């Protein structure tokens, strides 16, 4: 019943601002994703590296670099660093929160900031109002009006390949080369009933007087013609819909099917297009008030199972969860000693009977 202010990327090259104009830009570069550029002082910037991939199928994502007053984060498939150091997840300091599902990499600032990654093709960052009429990037300025609404002065218009080339940050030394206009941008228009009929299925009830169809269409019948081998791209552009009624408060339904693009998880994670954001963790770090936030999609384990964020061993009961500390895991049972107080690892926690000093 409360949403979110978010901008998007997803699928075959698709973007959603702040404000809503949804375009496509296939830049392989390096590009400012979100700044804060109006800021007297800068609170945080984005940067969204492509990197190389295949047509005809959603975009790769290689990196993502954040700047967030004096942290660093830089995320990739496989790596979370935080100001040059290769940490564990999930990686909890002052006021910055991050952590992995098997869903997403999401980071967390109590600067007024939230990111999601699924580690592909689908990348979400929602900002505090307080961020309005602040931003640079391809998310735009973040004032409440849209491209097709506006014209600046002399009659500077920027064609969405122009827009995402002005984002692009030059690496010293190394040579990466904007996109080519595109030849003959055909407008697939013969495909909208198939994606008007999936848009509109009995699952987004909730969801169409929430989110604007129209822009997600036109996404969709660019994919069924760009993307012509299979269903790859459209399904992005689905799930795409999907996450932006949650972001506006809504409740999607599950829309998938075996063969209207299944989505499952390993182990025995159950795949919800909508389920409560703050589960029971080994590390039991999910207790901020994020707890009340809208629900989102995701894997959730069975009831009597928490999720072990610890030693990655899928859906377990509570009492065997492993602890960590130093960078090292412990089983239900180990103890350790610091000063005067010596401390056995129970159900993922640390439970401590001081000693003589
Ligand atoms: C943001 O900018 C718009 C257009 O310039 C303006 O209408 C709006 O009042 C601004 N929001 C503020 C100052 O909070
Ligand atoms: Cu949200």
Same mark, same amino acid.
Request: hydrophobic residues 30%; glycine residues 8%.
């Given at each position: 019943?409360?949403?979110?202010?978010?901008?998007?990327?997803?699928?075959?090259?698709?973007?959603?601002?702040?404000?809503?104009?949804?375009?496509?830009?296939?830049?392989?570069?390096?590009?400012?994703?979100?700044?804060?550029?109006?800021?007297?002082?800068?609170?945080?910037?984005?940067?969204?590296?492509?990197?190389?991939?295949?047509?005809?199928?959603?975009?790769?994502?290689?990196?993502?670099?954040?700047?967030?007053?004096?942290?660093?984060?830089?995320?990739?498939?496989?790596?979370?660093?935080?100001?040059?150091?290769?940490?564990?997840?999930?990686?909890?300091?002052?006021?910055?929160?991050?952590?992995?599902?098997?869903?997403?990499?999401?980071?967390?600032?109590?600067?007024?900031?939230?990111?999601?990654?699924?580690?592909?093709?689908?990348?979400?960052?929602?900002?505090?109002?307080?961020?309005?009429?602040?931003? @640079?990037?391809?998310?735009?300025?973040?004032?409440?009006?849209?491209?097709?609404?506006?014209?600046?002065?002399?009659?500077?218009?920027?064609?969405?390949?122009?827009?995402?080339?002005?984002?692009?940050?030059?690496?010293?030394?190394?040579?990466?080369?904007?996109?080519?206009?595109?030849?003959?941008?055909?407008?697939?228009?013969?495909?909208?009933?198939?994606?008007?009929?999936?848009?509109?299925?009995?699952?987004?009830?909730?969801?169409?007087?929430?989110?604007?169809?129209?822009?997600?269409?036109?996404? @969709?019948?660019?994919?069924?013609?760009?993307?012509?081998?299979?269903?790859?791209?459209?399904?992005?552009?689905?799930?795409?819909?999907?996450?932006?009624?949650?972001?506006?408060?809504?409740?999607?339904?599950?829309?998938?099917?075996?063969?209207?693009?299944?989505?499952?998880?390993?182990?025995?994670?159950?795949?919800?297009?909508?389920?409560?954001?703050?589960?029971?963790?080994?590390?039991?770090?999910?207790?901020?008030?994020?707890?009340?936030?809208?629900?989102?999609?995701?894997?959730?384990?069975?009831?009597?199972?928490?999720?072990?964020?610890?030693?990655?061993?899928?859906?377990?009961?509570?009492?065997?969860?492993?602890?960590?500390?130093?960078?090292?895991?412990?089983?239900?049972?180990?103890?350790?000693?610091?000063?005067?107080?010596?401390?056995?690892?129970?159900?993922?926690?640390?439970?401590?009977?001081?000693?003589?000093?």
């Amino acid at each position: 019943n409360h949403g979110h202010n978010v901008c998007s990327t997803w699928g075959n090259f698709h973007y959603k601002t702040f404000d809503g104009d949804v375009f496509r830009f296939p830049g392989l570069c390096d590009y400012n994703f979100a700044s804060d550029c109006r800021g007297s002082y800068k609170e945080f910037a984005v940067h969204l590296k492509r990197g190389p991939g295949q047509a005809e199928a959603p975009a790769g994502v290689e990196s993502i670099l954040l700047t967030i007053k004096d942290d660093t984060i830089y995320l990739t498939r496989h790596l979370a660093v935080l100001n040059g150091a290769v940490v564990s997840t999930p990686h909890y300091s002052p006021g910055l929160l991050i952590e992995k599902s098997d869903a997403y990499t999401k980071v967390y600032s109590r600067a007024g900031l939230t990111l999601m990654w699924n580690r592909e093709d689908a990348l979400m960052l929602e900002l505090d109002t307080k961020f309005r009429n602040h931003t @640079c990037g391809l998310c735009g300025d973040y004032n409440g009006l849209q491209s097709y609404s506006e014209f600046l002065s002399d009659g500077v218009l920027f064609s969405p390949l122009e827009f995402g080339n002005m984002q692009k940050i030059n690496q010293p030394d190394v040579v990466c080369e904007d996109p080519e206009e595109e030849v003959a941008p055909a407008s697939c228009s013969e495909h909208r009933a198939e994606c008007e009929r999936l848009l509109t299925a009995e699952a987004f009830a909730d969801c169409q007087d929430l989110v604007p169809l129209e822009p997600y269409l036109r996404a @969709c019948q660019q994919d069924r013609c760009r993307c012509p081998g299979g269903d790859t791209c459209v399904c992005s552009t689905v799930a795409e819909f999907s996450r932006q009624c949650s972001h506006a408060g809504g409740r999607p339904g599950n829309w998938r099917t075996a063969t209207l693009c299944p989505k499952t998880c390993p182990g025995n994670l159950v795949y919800l297009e909508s389920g409560s954001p703050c589960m029971d963790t080994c590390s039991h770090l999910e207790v901020s008030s994020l707890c009340e936030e809208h629900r989102m999609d995701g894997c959730f384990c069975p009831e009597g199972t928490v999720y072990d964020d610890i030693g990655d061993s899928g859906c377990v009961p509570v009492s065997q969860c492993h602890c960590r500390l130093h960078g090292h895991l412990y089983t239900p049972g180990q103890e350790i000693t610091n000063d005067c107080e010596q401390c056995v690892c129970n159900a993922g926690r640390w439970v401590c009977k001081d000693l003589p000093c």
